[PDB]
Symmetry: C2
């Protein structure tokens, strides 16, 4: 591909971290723009972020061209990179294996994503989070990533599982000291050994390393978030 | 495609209907196995999915009645994944458009359905919550459509994903099914025939005209009957 690619995100957005991982896996040449400025309504009138501009002239990100195609919705941005760079095999080759990668993302979206938010941001009962974590965990093979090799599955879920672990280790979140104790114990137990290794293997992935600030930075960022208290 | 395809669904499931639409759009040779919602699910279904998940596809393996699933078939669940599977198996059907950008916009339209309207359909019709959010989400979805035609001009998986749900909620509305108050029902019915919602009204009848929808829908009267036997849709006395 030769069209210009520009990815827009807020600095520590997990949704934008999705698109950042996939552009890295793809070997793409792209501009990265972290931040809401007045100009941004030219990327998306609604202020939706993350966003990708595609095609048009090379432009500084804060001057998006009227010619470029503008795209939003993080999981569609994943599919987009995969489609633009088929040669990077961001998804596997067979339809069945692609179907399992997508099913795995749906498990995260439909079952775990909201309870992660209940347990860590709304201080709600933690029980359902751990069950949804297990359910996603159960869809992993004994080794490797969700469908064996790295795929959009990982781009989709990595930013969120890595932040969960970072928060739990750091005691950030709105859960009770009691529920926080219960989650630290679950994640360190054999029940959740598979998912814990998954995150470890995720965190070793070069595309994750590059698009993660480092634990230092993510932590400094984290400790300026209200909903984490 | 030479592999056998079998689609398992509880009857009248909008989730299974998604994949039905897509198999009909694809021109696929497929076997359709309907399970009764209100029975328990046959013991044999565990061989298609141990947790009883529907809808589900078996792919390949030997040719077998659906109640005799072969272990040699690959088994897939999750309706939005099943849509992308059919497109992947039948690329000549162009269930998604050709360019990455248009593909991305079709997938984004599915996201808007899921992020906003899907849960207000449940809240307003099955839980009886105030319906203002439901209208606003319908508007949000409506504003993502182009001036005419389908979400990305030509029909795509966007319609496979959203048609089963948009059609049932408009069916339920005109017939007054749901847990919402009777005032909120007149509010919704009035809003839907208003000019505010002309575009989404045009989208729904354009959906209902599509061959693949007609054949997988099997008529309003049988969808009404199916819905009058969903207990969660009944206001209590
Ligand atoms: O058998 C039927 C008939 C029908 O009309 C709708 C449904 C389900 C709708 C639904 C479920 C979960 C959710 O979060 C949101 C939803 O809209 C099932
Ligand atoms: O790779 C793909 C492609 C696609 O079209 C859909 C999905 C999955 C789930 C999904 C999408 C959007 C959303 O807001 C919620 C969802 O559950 C996965
Ligand atoms: Mg609600």
């Amino acid at each position: 591909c030769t069209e210009q690619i520009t990815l827009y995100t807020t600095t520590f957005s997990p949704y934008g971290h999705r698109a950042h991982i996939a552009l890295e896996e793809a070997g793409a040449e792209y501009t990265l723009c972290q931040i809401k400025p007045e100009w941004y309504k030219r990327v998306n009138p609604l202020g939706k972020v993350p966003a990708i501009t595609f095609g048009g002239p090379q432009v500084p990100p804060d001057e998006p061209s009227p010619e470029s195609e503008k795209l939003v919705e993080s999981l569609a941005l994943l599919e987009f990179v995969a489609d633009v760079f088929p040669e990077a095999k961001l998804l596997p080759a067979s339809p069945v294996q692609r179907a399992r990668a997508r099913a795995f993302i749906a498990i995260y979206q439909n079952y775990l994503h909201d309870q992660f938010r209940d347990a860590f941001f709304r201080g709600e009962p933690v029980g359902p989070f751990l069950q949804a974590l297990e359910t996603l965990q159960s869809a992993l093979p004994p080794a490797g990533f969700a469908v064996g090799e790295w795929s959009l599955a990982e781009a989709a879920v990595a930013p969120f599982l890595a932040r969960m672990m970072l928060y739990l280790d750091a005691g950030l979140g709105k859960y009770s000291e009691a529920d926080g104790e219960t989650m630290r114990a679950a994640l360190a137990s054999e029940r959740f050994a598979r998912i814990s290794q998954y995150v470890r293997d995720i965190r070793a992935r070069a595309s994750f390393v590059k698009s993660w600030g480092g634990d230092d930075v993510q932590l400094e960022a984290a400790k300026a978030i209200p909903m984490l208290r």
